[PDB]
Each structure stands twice: as C-alpha cells, then as structure tokens.
Amino acid sequence: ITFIMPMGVFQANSMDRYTRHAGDFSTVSEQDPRQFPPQGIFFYNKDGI
Amino acid sequence: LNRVARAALLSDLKRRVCADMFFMTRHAREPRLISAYLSDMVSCTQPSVMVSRITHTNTRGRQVDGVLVTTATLKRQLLQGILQIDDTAADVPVTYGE
Amino acid sequence: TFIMPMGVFQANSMDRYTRHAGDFSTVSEQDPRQFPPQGIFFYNKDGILTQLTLRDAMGTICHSSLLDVEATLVALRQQHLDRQCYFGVYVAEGTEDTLDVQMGRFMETWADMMPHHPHWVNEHLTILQFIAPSNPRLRFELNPAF
Amino acid sequence: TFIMPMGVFQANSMDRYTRHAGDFSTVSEQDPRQFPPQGIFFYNKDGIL
Amino acid sequence: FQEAYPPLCSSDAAMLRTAHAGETGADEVHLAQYLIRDASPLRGCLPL
Amino acid sequence: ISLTHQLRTGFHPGIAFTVVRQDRFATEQLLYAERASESYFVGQIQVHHHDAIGGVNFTLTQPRAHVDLGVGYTAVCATAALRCPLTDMGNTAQNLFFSRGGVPMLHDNVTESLRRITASGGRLNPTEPLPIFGGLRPATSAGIARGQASVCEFVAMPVSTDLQYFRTACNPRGRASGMLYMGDRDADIEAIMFDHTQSDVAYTDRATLNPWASQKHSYGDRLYNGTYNLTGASPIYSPCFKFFTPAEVNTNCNTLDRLLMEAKAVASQSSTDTEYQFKRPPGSTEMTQDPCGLFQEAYPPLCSSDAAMLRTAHAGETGADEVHLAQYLIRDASPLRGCLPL
Amino acid sequence: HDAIGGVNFTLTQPRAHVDLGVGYTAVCATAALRCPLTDMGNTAQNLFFSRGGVPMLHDNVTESLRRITASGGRLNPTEPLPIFGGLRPATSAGIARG
Amino acid sequence: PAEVNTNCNTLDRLLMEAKAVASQSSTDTEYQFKRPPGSTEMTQDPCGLFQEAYPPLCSSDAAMLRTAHAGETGADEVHLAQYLIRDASPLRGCLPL
Amino acid sequence: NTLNFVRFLELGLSVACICTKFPELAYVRDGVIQFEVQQPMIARDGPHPVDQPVHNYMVKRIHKRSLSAAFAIASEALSLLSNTYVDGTEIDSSLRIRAIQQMARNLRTVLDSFERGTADQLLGVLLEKAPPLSLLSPINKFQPEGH
Amino acid sequence: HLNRVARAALLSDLKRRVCADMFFMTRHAREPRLISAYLSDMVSCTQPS
Structure with missing residues (x-):
C-alpha cells in the first residue's frame, strides 16, 4: 500500500493549555530547551527495541 | 388520570424512550435480557376477535398467537441463542371462505 | 437533533475551579484557561471532532434580520401600558440661559418627576433574579441589539 | 421525609481541613471556599441539579 | 479512491518508554512535542 | 458590520450561541401482530387492454379492502437495530442570505459586501449572479459528500447562561413547551409556550433560560418561527423549525391517545433527493419514526468547549472531566452511547 | 330511587368480619419501588397564607413585605386577596414532572 | 405531641401505629395541600412512627457533587468549608442520578 | 363481548376466610366471640419465686360493613314495560324485547359485582389487619416472653 | 433506484469497512463469541438459484 509521513507537527487553533499530573521539564531555573519545538524523526525496526 | 399521575407517567415515558431505543445493537451481549423484553412486547398488545373454524396450528395442535416480522439478520440473532424453537413445521389453512 | 452551547462562560467564580493545583495549566506566564472559550468541538458522524466557532454564526447574525424590529414594536404597542415617569427616556432642548438657571429649574422639576424607581437602574440584579418571572423588565428584553 | 442542613458553618478550626493541598484551586488570590456556604445542592426526581 | 491506516506514537517519546508493553500511552500528549498514534490493524501481538 | 469585523478578527462579542443540527439514521425495525389484526377483503380481477407501441397492454387490476377488527392495539413496532448513520454530523453554518423579503438595508453596497463576507467562510451560498425570479439554489454540487450535508442553525443567548442546562435532554427554545402538558382548559398551549408571567414548567424556578429566543416576538422567534415565514424562499431545511412553531391542536382526544397517534411514523421533512438537506420536496413519501420531535427535546452529543478534555488516559473510554476552569466537556446523553465508537 | 327520568335500584347487602387469631394472622411488606409520584423540587413554603398573628403596625410595611416575598417564589396568595376566602395559590399551566 | 393512652404496653402500640395510617396530604393537586375532607387513602408511613428523617445526597457545592470518572458521584466529606452529606435514606440504589 | 363470571370460591384467596350465611344479620348489635387460653409452667429452685400456672380470657367483637351496587333503567324502558302506551303491533314488540335484553x-x-367485590373487601380488611414484616419479625424473635 | 445518499457514501459508510475488524489468528489468544461474527456471518448468506 502507500502511506504518507511527518517531521514534528504543530496544531493551530489556540485551545490547549491544560494539565493532569505534574512537576515539569523544568529545573531550579527557567527556560533552556523547554517551551519549545518537539523532536523530529526516529524509529523502531524489527523485533522489540 | 389526574395531572400529577400524567406528569409522572410522562417523565417515566421520556426516560424509557431515551433508553430503550436500539435495543438489538446495544444489549447484544445479553441473550437472557433479550428474551426478557421480547416477552414484554408480546404481552403488551390486546387480542382480537375469536371467530374462526380452522386456524394456524403446530404439529402438536396448539394454536399460534401471532406473527413477528424481522429482517433476516434479526431473525438469525433471535434464533441463534435467544429464543427457543418450538416446532419447525406448521398447519396452515388452505381455503379462503367466500 | 443534537444541541450544543458555544460561547457559554461560567460567570460564577466558584464554578471556575480546577480539580487539582493545575488541572489545566501552562508554562507561559498567563494560564489562558481563564479566557472565555470561542469554539465547540464535537465528534463527527465519523469519530471526528470538527470545529464550530463564533465566526460560523456570522451567516445567521450578520444578516439584516437583526434590525427588523418594526413588527416587534407593532406587537408590543397592543398591550396594556401604565403611565410611567419619563425621566430616563426624554430629551429636551435648551432655553438659552446661563446653564445655572437651567440646572436649578431641572432640579426643582426633578424633585417630583419620578413617582417611583426607574427600571433601568436595577442593574444590581443577578442572573437568577433577572430571569425570574416577577421581574417587570423581562418582557421588554427581546432583541440583543435593541 | 428528607432533611438537609443548609447554612451550617463548621465553626471549629480543626474541622476545616483539606484532604489534599491542590484539591480545588482557582485563579483568584483568595480561595472562594473559605467563605461560609449559602446554598445546598441536591438531585431532583429526574437527576436534574 | 481516497482514505487512510495507522499505528501508535509519541514525539517527545520522552513520552515513549516506561515499563509496560500492552496498553500504556493514550492521552494524547505530555509537554511540547508530538505524540502520534494507532489505528491500522494488529493490536497486541509479539511482545516488544 | 462590527459583528463581521469582530467575529472575523478573533474577538468574542458579548453573546453566545446554541447550535441545533438534525440527523438521520437507518434502522431495522421489529414488528409483532396478533391473529385477527386485519379483516381483509378481496375483489375480482378485471382487465383493461390498452394499445401500445406495436401491440397491446393488458393491465390486470383488482380491488381490496382492509379493516381493523381489534378493540385495543393489535400491532406493536419497535425500532431494533442501529444500522448506518445516513447524514453527516458536520460543522455546518446555515446561510441566511437565501431568504428574501425582510426590510433591506439602505445602502445596497453594504448589503452586497455583507453577502460576500457571509457567503465567505462557509459552504452554501447564493450563486454569484444572484438570479431574480429564482429559487436561489446553492452553487450546484459536484460529486457528493459523505452524508447529506446536515445544516446547523444558531440561536442567540446571553453569555452567562447556566451550563448545567445542556448536560441533559434540553430544549433549544430555552423554555420547555409542547402539547404534553394539559388538564384544565383548552387554550393553555399558548400560555405554556409564550406567557412569561408564569414560571417555566420543567425548571420550575425561572421564566426562561434565555429571554432572547422565548418570548412572543423575540429575536429567535421572529427569525425561525414558521408562522411568520421569514425563510420561505430559502430551500434550506431549518432543523429548529419544529421547536419554535406552535403545533395545531384538537383537544377532543385525551393526551395519551393523541401521544400514541403522533408516535407513529410521521412523514419526512428533509430531503432524500437534494443534497444540502433542503426542504421536503413535493411528492416525497418516506415514513420516518421521529423521536425528540413529539417531546420537543434535543439530545446533547459528546462535545467539549475544548479539544482538551475530549480524550483521556487509558486507551479506551474518552475523557470524562466535566469542567476545568472556563472550558467544559458535555458528556454524551444521546441514544448513541454504546454505538458510534471513537 | 327515582332519577333521570326513570328509576335506579341500589342493591345493598350487609356483612361482617371477625379476626379469629390469637396472634397476628397477616403480614405485609413493601416489595418493589415504582415511579415516585412527587417532585424532589424546591418550592419554599410561604407563611403569608396564615392569618391571626399580631400584624405589623404600619400596613404599607406588611404589604411591601408580602410583595417582596412574592418575587422569587412559585406559590403565593392571589393578588385580589379575597376577604372571606381560602387564600389559595393561583392555579398554573400544565404540570411538568409531578 | 400525638395523643396517647398508656394502658397497653409500648410494643403493641408500636405495632398499632405501624399499620398503613390514613394519608395526610393530597394527590390530585399541584401543590400538596392539606388532607381534603372525605378522602380515605391508606398509606404506610415509616419515619413517622419513629419521629425521624433521612438525609438525602446533598452538598454545599455542585463542584464536589460529581467526580470526573464517567460514573459514580463524588464522595469526599469536607473539602475546605463546604460539605457533602452521603445519602443514608433507604433509596440508596434507586432513583437514577 | 361476553364477560366471564367469577365465583369467589374458585379464587385462591378463599382459603383465608371461613364464609357463612346469616339471614338475620341486620338485627345483630354486638357479635361477641370468646377465648380461654392456658399457659404451661416449669419448676425451678434457688432465689426464684415459685410460680403458678396462668389462664387468659380474651374476647373479641364483630365489625360490620356493607356492599352496594347500582342498576339503572331509562324512562323509555319503563314506558315499554308498563304497557301504558302500547299499540299492539309488531314494531314495538322488538323494542320491548330490546329493553328486556338490556x-x-x-x-x-350487577349480581356478579357482589361476587367480584367480596374478594376486594377481603383484601381491604387483610391489608388493614397486617402489621409490617420488618417490625413483626424482630419483635417476635428478640423478646423471649415479654414484660 | 437510489440517489447521491448510498454510494457518495460508498467511501463514508463502506470505509467503515475501512476501519475495524480484520485478519484472524494470533495476538489476542483469548476470544470465542465474535470471531465467528465475520467467521459465523461470511460462509452462508442469501438469495437462491
């Protein structure tokens, strides 16, 4: 068959500032790489790893 | 009925129609409850006149009491495990009477 | 027939409660769950949320029908009306005075212009009291633009 | 016959406890639950609040 | 004609691996990344 | 015009809307009948020979008659299985420019620009030439869709409206009405549905949920009510026409019997040959059992004010958090609970 | 008994019963629950239906107090305040749910 | 204070008041008026011979009246100064919510 | 429609009552029934008062009720029956026979109503007689004797 | 004699038949009352000749 595929995608409609269970990708301090864009492309090939 | 009984009956009726809607595809996994309200459906209609000479009966001789029309899929779901067969042949009148 | 509200904003402050510390928060300085919602998101025929927003209502509200009040006035004019003071609904003309004598005359007249309390001052009413049938102003609130 | 206390305020301080810190938080700087209650909420005949 | 199949993802899969192999990540999302998922055929075969 | 500006820009003017959308589903029925349900009479055949292209046509015809020889009810049908949904639960802005007759605005240029911006952002639009002496049919569809386009109508309502109203089977008018409430007189079908000196029947502590779509000549009634016939020329079906229109009355029969009479398969009021859910075409005869039409109720489907809570953390059941801060999730209450998976 | 235009016969028969049991000879116990006939609503009891207590000195105060109590309630004395009456609540339209 | 004779013992009287006492309300009216004259309706009456009342499921805040799990209602007792009285009336498993 | 007549005896409820006729019932003032019941006794020693066997005498009285049913005749039926305005022709004989059939x-x-309603009265009296189970069972259990 | 409601949705209802149930055997080693719901409804079905 065919499919299609991706690099990080983004949403648009500004409707998602929610939360469920948490102390987050955040340290003693403020804003190195975390309010930021995702990562990308990788995978997971034959038999488990 | 007076007003209050009618209102209570109305609310109960609304609840019932909201619940008992797609009964054959919602409670498909409970064969015993299916037979539990089919019997309610059969025993909710009033009978009609009893004038006749020869009627539809089974091989034993017991007279039938109605007809229940379905779609083939429904007929099969009922026959599979819900309703129990009584007889596979029937006695049918073969004249009109003019 | 399915029904869904769109721009409803829970006015009461106790209703804007979150089920834990941040049971919907952010990393930004302003948690924008406090901003009023503007869209509704429902599963389609298909297992699909889709979007209905305020802007889709523009096909219904921005028509000229929003300003077709004439029939409403004709219908309203045919009921029992009691003589009410005209303090808040009357506009006069000047009398080329010193703007001081005019104010004094207005005060003297205003000593007894109103035999009761005007209906348009009672804005302290909460929504439940406003909706209640005893509110006399309720039957005069028909169009959102009038 | 059903009976419901309506405006009762638990006077003693020890009883005004919360089972967790973040149980029902808000955006206001003052939690709008320390204030004495003024209403009672129950279920109608049909489940209506 | 026209339309499409899929499996279950996570991209910061710093929403991917803690100890299960079964039914684990399904609420769409954790901080600012993109956490794709799962709807072509085979559920639960062949443990990881 | 300012509504155009704000609603486009992203602003939120101080009003709120309630949507209503009508849907169809194909269902397989289940019928039972007793022995002497129908006394059935058969005539004698007679033949008309009618000339044809080269030969003759014999049309055998035979008359017959049927009678209900049952004191009570001798047949009960119950909708049984949910087969395929027929129409689309899309996001459909109804276009109100299909209607002609209202008092037009003074400057025709403004009206033209409004029509351009209204046909904007939407599907169903009067065709560009704007034909005079025409039905103003939408730009005719190409290939068809996934389901008949189900139009969604909007009704204005105040912003601070009790959200709990919509979490159950509510009524779009805001004040529950209908024939089902009677008992002392005959001219109470008007007092219930329009008199606002009396409390609402259902929520018996308030006059009406919204005062903009419940009074005798309010905005909502003036725009959708069928007795004023504002959208007469518009071929678009209005899914909330059945809630705002006073039904005709005969009080001779008691309420229960009349309920049963209305309960059977009423004639269709939508389109099965025209693709935008147009008004019922003349000569169309489809028999459709119609719940939530004889009770004047609308069921709220699984919808949330936010893409947020709609979906939760177990790969199974959907999200169940009701309200978080100012968003909300209206849990499903329609008869489509165990069907239409997610 | 003569009525309408003709006659009515009322057939009567006296009969009597005795409980000839030393202990208790009959036991009843509620079994099932049907639809609740009443409403679990919120209709505040209105004390303005009662007459007899010492009235307030100024009549206008009492009238204003009654009027303000009327707002935000369902059942209230009718506006004419019929002297020599039951002070019954004004009847309403159809009943919703009991 | 109900009128009482004390010649017989307590238990027999308890059984006598335990029968279906006559109704003390109205059925056909829309507002639960007093018992209309000449109406003889026989209704069993609990919590009237024990002089007690049962508290139903009530709370001081609609927020805790329901939990976010798509199912049963909330059951927390006291959060900060509100309250949630669990149902203790005989109608525990009836009256759908 | 042919209504089916019900005889009270055939009903299973008949097992709960001892029916008996009594033509001169309207002249009964206070029907009285009597009981005399003796109780057993056991002997003990020690610091217990020596007891004596007891007798009880209980007397109950009759309670009287009634049953009534109606029966209507229209004016024309009386006119046809009394033969006051008869013309002696075959046209009115059919009318008379119709009236008599009615x-x-x-x-x-009307006669069947008494049979059908005796069961109703028995249900009524049994309901008015029965204490609730929820009270009767523990009372008859957790007290050995009384006092 | 149908119109543009059945096959214009030939891709919107059928492609149901594009999203649930599947190729028999061996991951969920654990289920007998639907494996014969396309096994016990695809072998014997309709009109005669």
Whole structure:
C-alpha cells in the first residue's frame, strides 16, 4: 500500500493549555530547551527495541 | 388520570424512550435480557376477535398467537441463542371462505 | 437533533475551579484557561471532532434580520401600558440661559418627576433574579441589539 | 421525609481541613471556599441539579 | 479512491518508554512535542 | 458590520450561541401482530387492454379492502437495530442570505459586501449572479459528500447562561413547551409556550433560560418561527423549525391517545433527493419514526468547549472531566452511547 | 330511587368480619419501588397564607413585605386577596414532572 | 405531641401505629395541600412512627457533587468549608442520578 | 363481548376466610366471640419465686360493613314495560324485547359485582389487619416472653 | 433506484469497512463469541438459484 509521513507537527487553533499530573521539564531555573519545538524523526525496526 | 399521575407517567415515558431505543445493537451481549423484553412486547398488545373454524396450528395442535416480522439478520440473532424453537413445521389453512 | 452551547462562560467564580493545583495549566506566564472559550468541538458522524466557532454564526447574525424590529414594536404597542415617569427616556432642548438657571429649574422639576424607581437602574440584579418571572423588565428584553 | 442542613458553618478550626493541598484551586488570590456556604445542592426526581 | 491506516506514537517519546508493553500511552500528549498514534490493524501481538 | 469585523478578527462579542443540527439514521425495525389484526377483503380481477407501441397492454387490476377488527392495539413496532448513520454530523453554518423579503438595508453596497463576507467562510451560498425570479439554489454540487450535508442553525443567548442546562435532554427554545402538558382548559398551549408571567414548567424556578429566543416576538422567534415565514424562499431545511412553531391542536382526544397517534411514523421533512438537506420536496413519501420531535427535546452529543478534555488516559473510554476552569466537556446523553465508537 | 327520568335500584347487602387469631394472622411488606409520584423540587413554603398573628403596625410595611416575598417564589396568595376566602395559590399551566 | 393512652404496653402500640395510617396530604393537586375532607387513602408511613428523617445526597457545592470518572458521584466529606452529606435514606440504589 | 363470571370460591384467596350465611344479620348489635387460653409452667429452685400456672380470657367483637351496587333503567324502558302506551303491533314488540335484553344483561353483571367485590373487601380488611414484616419479625424473635 | 445518499457514501459508510475488524489468528489468544461474527456471518448468506 502507500502511506504518507511527518517531521514534528504543530496544531493551530489556540485551545490547549491544560494539565493532569505534574512537576515539569523544568529545573531550579527557567527556560533552556523547554517551551519549545518537539523532536523530529526516529524509529523502531524489527523485533522489540 | 389526574395531572400529577400524567406528569409522572410522562417523565417515566421520556426516560424509557431515551433508553430503550436500539435495543438489538446495544444489549447484544445479553441473550437472557433479550428474551426478557421480547416477552414484554408480546404481552403488551390486546387480542382480537375469536371467530374462526380452522386456524394456524403446530404439529402438536396448539394454536399460534401471532406473527413477528424481522429482517433476516434479526431473525438469525433471535434464533441463534435467544429464543427457543418450538416446532419447525406448521398447519396452515388452505381455503379462503367466500 | 443534537444541541450544543458555544460561547457559554461560567460567570460564577466558584464554578471556575480546577480539580487539582493545575488541572489545566501552562508554562507561559498567563494560564489562558481563564479566557472565555470561542469554539465547540464535537465528534463527527465519523469519530471526528470538527470545529464550530463564533465566526460560523456570522451567516445567521450578520444578516439584516437583526434590525427588523418594526413588527416587534407593532406587537408590543397592543398591550396594556401604565403611565410611567419619563425621566430616563426624554430629551429636551435648551432655553438659552446661563446653564445655572437651567440646572436649578431641572432640579426643582426633578424633585417630583419620578413617582417611583426607574427600571433601568436595577442593574444590581443577578442572573437568577433577572430571569425570574416577577421581574417587570423581562418582557421588554427581546432583541440583543435593541 | 428528607432533611438537609443548609447554612451550617463548621465553626471549629480543626474541622476545616483539606484532604489534599491542590484539591480545588482557582485563579483568584483568595480561595472562594473559605467563605461560609449559602446554598445546598441536591438531585431532583429526574437527576436534574 | 481516497482514505487512510495507522499505528501508535509519541514525539517527545520522552513520552515513549516506561515499563509496560500492552496498553500504556493514550492521552494524547505530555509537554511540547508530538505524540502520534494507532489505528491500522494488529493490536497486541509479539511482545516488544 | 462590527459583528463581521469582530467575529472575523478573533474577538468574542458579548453573546453566545446554541447550535441545533438534525440527523438521520437507518434502522431495522421489529414488528409483532396478533391473529385477527386485519379483516381483509378481496375483489375480482378485471382487465383493461390498452394499445401500445406495436401491440397491446393488458393491465390486470383488482380491488381490496382492509379493516381493523381489534378493540385495543393489535400491532406493536419497535425500532431494533442501529444500522448506518445516513447524514453527516458536520460543522455546518446555515446561510441566511437565501431568504428574501425582510426590510433591506439602505445602502445596497453594504448589503452586497455583507453577502460576500457571509457567503465567505462557509459552504452554501447564493450563486454569484444572484438570479431574480429564482429559487436561489446553492452553487450546484459536484460529486457528493459523505452524508447529506446536515445544516446547523444558531440561536442567540446571553453569555452567562447556566451550563448545567445542556448536560441533559434540553430544549433549544430555552423554555420547555409542547402539547404534553394539559388538564384544565383548552387554550393553555399558548400560555405554556409564550406567557412569561408564569414560571417555566420543567425548571420550575425561572421564566426562561434565555429571554432572547422565548418570548412572543423575540429575536429567535421572529427569525425561525414558521408562522411568520421569514425563510420561505430559502430551500434550506431549518432543523429548529419544529421547536419554535406552535403545533395545531384538537383537544377532543385525551393526551395519551393523541401521544400514541403522533408516535407513529410521521412523514419526512428533509430531503432524500437534494443534497444540502433542503426542504421536503413535493411528492416525497418516506415514513420516518421521529423521536425528540413529539417531546420537543434535543439530545446533547459528546462535545467539549475544548479539544482538551475530549480524550483521556487509558486507551479506551474518552475523557470524562466535566469542567476545568472556563472550558467544559458535555458528556454524551444521546441514544448513541454504546454505538458510534471513537 | 327515582332519577333521570326513570328509576335506579341500589342493591345493598350487609356483612361482617371477625379476626379469629390469637396472634397476628397477616403480614405485609413493601416489595418493589415504582415511579415516585412527587417532585424532589424546591418550592419554599410561604407563611403569608396564615392569618391571626399580631400584624405589623404600619400596613404599607406588611404589604411591601408580602410583595417582596412574592418575587422569587412559585406559590403565593392571589393578588385580589379575597376577604372571606381560602387564600389559595393561583392555579398554573400544565404540570411538568409531578 | 400525638395523643396517647398508656394502658397497653409500648410494643403493641408500636405495632398499632405501624399499620398503613390514613394519608395526610393530597394527590390530585399541584401543590400538596392539606388532607381534603372525605378522602380515605391508606398509606404506610415509616419515619413517622419513629419521629425521624433521612438525609438525602446533598452538598454545599455542585463542584464536589460529581467526580470526573464517567460514573459514580463524588464522595469526599469536607473539602475546605463546604460539605457533602452521603445519602443514608433507604433509596440508596434507586432513583437514577 | 361476553364477560366471564367469577365465583369467589374458585379464587385462591378463599382459603383465608371461613364464609357463612346469616339471614338475620341486620338485627345483630354486638357479635361477641370468646377465648380461654392456658399457659404451661416449669419448676425451678434457688432465689426464684415459685410460680403458678396462668389462664387468659380474651374476647373479641364483630365489625360490620356493607356492599352496594347500582342498576339503572331509562324512562323509555319503563314506558315499554308498563304497557301504558302500547299499540299492539309488531314494531314495538322488538323494542320491548330490546329493553328486556338490556335489563337482563345489566342484572347479570350487577349480581356478579357482589361476587367480584367480596374478594376486594377481603383484601381491604387483610391489608388493614397486617402489621409490617420488618417490625413483626424482630419483635417476635428478640423478646423471649415479654414484660 | 437510489440517489447521491448510498454510494457518495460508498467511501463514508463502506470505509467503515475501512476501519475495524480484520485478519484472524494470533495476538489476542483469548476470544470465542465474535470471531465467528465475520467467521459465523461470511460462509452462508442469501438469495437462491
């Protein structure tokens, strides 16, 4: 068959500032790489790893 | 009925129609409850006149009491495990009477 | 027939409660769950949320029908009306005075212009009291633009 | 016959406890639950609040 | 004609691996990344 | 015009809307009948020979008659299985420019620009030439869709409206009405549905949920009510026409019997040959059992004010958090609970 | 008994019963629950239906107090305040749910 | 204070008041008026011979009246100064919510 | 429609009552029934008062009720029956026979009503007599004797 | 004699038949009352000749 595929995608409609269970990708301090864009492309090939 | 009984009956009726809607595809996994309200459906209609000479009966001789029309899929779901067969042949009148 | 509200904003402050510390928060300085919602998101025929927003209502509200009040006035004019003071609904003309004598005359007249309390001052009413049938102003609130 | 206390305020301080810190938080700087209650909420005949 | 199949993802899969192999990540999302998922055929075969 | 500006820009003017959308589903029925349900009479055949292209046509015809020889009810049908949904639960802005007759605005240029911006952002639009002496049919569809386009109508309502109203089977008018409430007189079908000196029947502590779509000549009634016939020329079906229109009355029969009479398969009021859910075409005869039409109720489907809570953390059941801060999730209450998976 | 235009016969028969049991000879116990006939609503009891207590000195105060109590309630004395009456609540339209 | 004779013992009287006492309300009216004259309706009456009342499921805040799990209602007792009285009336498993 | 007549004896409820006729019932003032019951006794020693066997005498009285049913006759029926305005022609004989058929078909149901309603009265009295189970069971269990 | 409601949705209802149930055997080693719901409804079905 065919499919299609991706690099990080983004949403648009500004409707998602929610939360469920948490102390987050955040340290003693403020804003190195975390309010930021995702990562990308990788995978997971034959038999488990 | 007076007003209050009618209102209570109305609310109960609304609840019932909201619940008992797609009964054959919602409670498909409970064969015993299916037979539990089919019997309610059969025993909710009033009978009609009893004038006749020869009627539809089974091989034993017991007279039938109605007809229940379905779609083939429904007929099969009922026959599979819900309703129990009584007889596979029937006695049918073969004249009109003019 | 399915029904869904769109721009409803829970006015009461106790209703804007979150089920834990941040049971919907952010990393930004302003948690924008406090901003009023503007869209509704429902599963389609298909297992699909889709979007209905305020802007889709523009096909219904921005028509000229929003300003077709004439029939409403004709219908309203045919009921029992009691003589009410005209303090808040009357506009006069000047009398080329010193703007001081005019104010004094207005005060003297205003000593007894109103035999009761005007209906348009009672804005302290909460929504439940406003909706209640005893509110006399309720039957005069028909169009959102009038 | 059903009976419901309506405006009762638990006077003693020890009883005004919360089972967790973040149980029902808000955006206001003052939690709008320390204030004495003024209403009672129950279920109608049909489940209506 | 026209339309499409899929499996279950996570991209910061710093929403991917803690100890299960079964039914684990399904609420769409954790901080600012993109956490794709799962709807072509085979559920639960062949443990990881 | 300012509504155009704000609603486009992203602003939120101080009003709120309630949507209503009508849907169809194909269902397989289940019928039972007793022995002497129908006394059935058969005539004698007679033949008309009618000339044809080269030969003759014999049309055998035979008359017959049927009678209900049952004191009570001798047949009960119950909708049984949910087969395929027929129409689309899309996001459909109804276009109100299909209607002609209202008092037009003074400057025709403004009206033209409004029509351009209204046909904007939407599907169903009067065709560009704007034909005079025409039905103003939408730009005719190409290939068809996934389901008949189900139009969604909007009704204005105040912003601070009790959200709990919509979490159950509510009524779009805001004040529950209908024939089902009677008992002392005959001219109470008007007092219930329009008199606002009396409390609402259902929520018996308030006059009406919204005062903009419940009074005798309010905005909502003036725009959708069928007795004023504002959208007469518009071929678009209005899914909330059945809630705002006073039904005709005969009080001779008691309420229960009349309920049963209305309960059977009423004639269709939508389109099965025209693709935008147009008004019922003349000569169309489809028999459709119609719940939530004889009770004047609308069921709220699984919808949330936010893409947020709609979906939760177990790969199974959907999200169940009701309200978080100012968003909300209206849990499903329609008869489509165990069907239409997610 | 003569009525309408003709006659009515009322057939009567006296009969009597005795409980000839030393202990208790009959036991009843509620079994099932049907639809609740009443409403679990919120209709505040209105004390303005009662007459007899010492009235307030100024009549206008009492009238204003009654009027303000009327707002935000369902059942209230009718506006004419019929002297020599039951002070019954004004009847309403159809009943919703009991 | 109900009128009482004390010649017989307590238990027999308890059984006598335990029968279906006559109704003390109205059925056909829309507002639960007093018992209309000449109406003889026989209704069993609990919590009237024990002089007690049962508290139903009530709370001081609609927020805790329901939990976010798509199912049963909330059951927390006291959060900060509100309250949630669990149902203790005989109608525990009836009256759908 | 042919209504089916019900005889009270055939009903299973008949097992709960001892029916008996009594033509001169309207002259009864206070029907009285009597009981005399003796109780057993056991002997003990020690610091217990020596006891004596007891007798009880209980007397109950009759409670009187009644049953009533109606039966209507229209004016034309009386006119046809009294033969006051008869013309001696075959046209009115059919009318008279129709009236008599109505009367007889009516009287049959009127008489059947007493049979059908004796069961109703028995249910009524048994309901008015029965204490609730939830009280009767523990009371008859957790007290050995009384006092 | 149908119109543009059945096959214009030939891709919107059928492609149901594009999203649930599947190729028999061996991951969920654990289920007998639907494996014969396309096994016990695809072998014997309709009109005669």
